Swiss-Prot record, chains A, B:
It is linked to Estrogen resistance: A disorder characterized by partial or complete resistance to estrogens, in the presence of elevated estrogen serum levels. Clinical features include absence of the pubertal growth spurt, delayed bone maturation, unfused epiphyses, reduced bone mineral density, osteoporosis, continued growth into adulthood and very tall adult stature. Glucose intolerance, hyperinsulinemia and lipid abnormalities may also be present. This is Estrogen receptor. Residues 5-233 are annotated as: Transactivation AF-2. Changing V55E: Has higher transcriptional activity in the absence of wild type ER. Inhibits transcriptional activity when coexpressed with the wild type receptor. GO terms for biological process: androgen metabolic process; antral ovarian follicle growth; cellular response to estradiol stimulus; cellular response to estrogen stimulus; chromatin remodeling; epithelial cell development; epithelial cell proliferation involved in mammary gland duct elongation; estrogen receptor signaling pathway.
Length: 233, 233
């Protein structure tokens, strides 16, 4: 992983991309929104595990540290994927190609419209920046490696060092993408910062979302350490 | 603000720095922790308002947008200040020079030790990076301008554009600081990214902290829109 070139980092990430899934509802029947969203998210998580194992550097970590990173990052990763898919659909969130919802549809569940609105504003920001696919895959990998790295022994010190080295490679890769597209050195640093600052907002959204999910007080909601460990092991 | 040089941006920020306050308890009497922490934080907020009015670009915004940004960012700003003050005190949090607490002292309040631990790990990270004073003031200004900019009319479009232009100036300023200290171009971009990614974790902490404060269910806890508007107006 640490010997990959920038172009090789980009190809590895593009090749690891998970598929876009569909909502499971009978389209011949009349139009539970949270049920549909939960079932979709549960299926996405399985693909998320397979993706994570393909991000360079990730399978070099201990299984316990892989679980901790996914546990910290899984809702941020679902959210950045949602916002990316929704970028060319102003005013709507493309949960799936058969489940395109507006903010009015969000008002059906108490507390959801506020989350819908933050996600729509994020998609708006990505549109304004003209975010590219190759930049998006870099940012999603940065979420995976960064979100849990501050919340974890000699082995732990070695693991954190490695994670920071991999993050440095992804930064190099972003900058290389921006240099390729012709931006100046000033423009490169400015855009790097613009991109990474949106990650702060994605964290914020994930925390507001997790508050919603925990408030459900339900064993079939939020993947456990043990479920994540079973799927990763 | 947008015509400031990098050196002028740095001096303006260093000159705007608020003072380090002391805890109000009688030091001759025997050793409520949350009472002491709340009273300190309430006094810090008043200085925070005066600081914010001195960050270049901030008073160019509407009063309502100034309130919204402070409302989003005030706990992150208290937290980054705490972690900076604690950097040369391994294992301790320097809430004030007369109130230096360890994680064991945090266990006295339900849910607090988890927050204490995240703040201590952040201070540890800043130590590992050897964060400098001039970098710290840049990052605190970036929190102020970025935390609320995704959650806000023609005026609103003009305000968001301005905020992003000011953020771009602070990015330039960070990079200039790093070039001055002798780092290579690679090292500059890498360190910029390292710094901005810690801001994601600071957001995370602020959200966990706000959950604690809201759970108190108390009108004397968390500054209202109206109190912030009164102090800013
Ligand atoms: C399919 C999908 C659902 C959601 C998001 C992105 C997605 O790609 C982000 C917004 N979020 C809504 C937000 C309020 C969390 C939903 C959602 C809904 C339910 C669950 C539940 C999972 C579980 O119980 O295991 C997770 C995400
Ligand atoms: C003085 C100070 C207190 C705290 C932090 C940083 C500080 O500089 C961050 C950790 N946080 C503790 C965290 C659990 C919020 C405390 C704290 C405690 C109480 C309040 C209450 C304010 C109010 O009621 O208006 C705010 C911050």
């Amino acid at each position: 992983a640490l010997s990959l070139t920038a172009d090789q980092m980009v190809s590895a990430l593009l090749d690891a991309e998970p598929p876009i899934l569909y909502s499971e509802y009978d389209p011949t029947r009349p139009f539970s929104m949270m049920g549909l969203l939960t079932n979709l998210a549960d299926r996405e998580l399985v693909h998320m595990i397979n993706w994570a194992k393909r991000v360079p550097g990730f399978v070099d970590l201990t299984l316990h540290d892989q679980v901790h990173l996914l546990e910290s990052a899984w809702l941020e990763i679902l959210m950045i994927g949602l916002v990316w898919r929704s970028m060319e659909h102003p005013g709507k969130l493309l949960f799936a190609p058969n489940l395109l919802l507006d903010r009015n549809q969000g008002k059906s569940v108490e507390g959801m419209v506020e989350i819908f609105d933050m996600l729509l504003a994020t998609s708006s920001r990505f549109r304004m920046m003209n975010l590219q696919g190759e930049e998006f895959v870099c940012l999603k990998s940065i979420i995976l490696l960064n979100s849990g790295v501050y919340t974890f022994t000699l082995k732990s010190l070695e693991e954190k060092d490695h994670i920071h080295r991999v993050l440095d490679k992804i930064t190099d890769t972003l900058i290389h993408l921006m240099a390729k597209a012709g931006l100046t050195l000033q423009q490169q640093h400015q855009r790097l910062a613009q991109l990474l600052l949106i990650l702060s907002h994605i964290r914020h959204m994930s925390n507001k979302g997790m508050e919603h999910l925990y408030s459900m007080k339900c064993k079939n909601v939020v993947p456990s350490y043990d479920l994540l460990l079973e799927m990763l092991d």
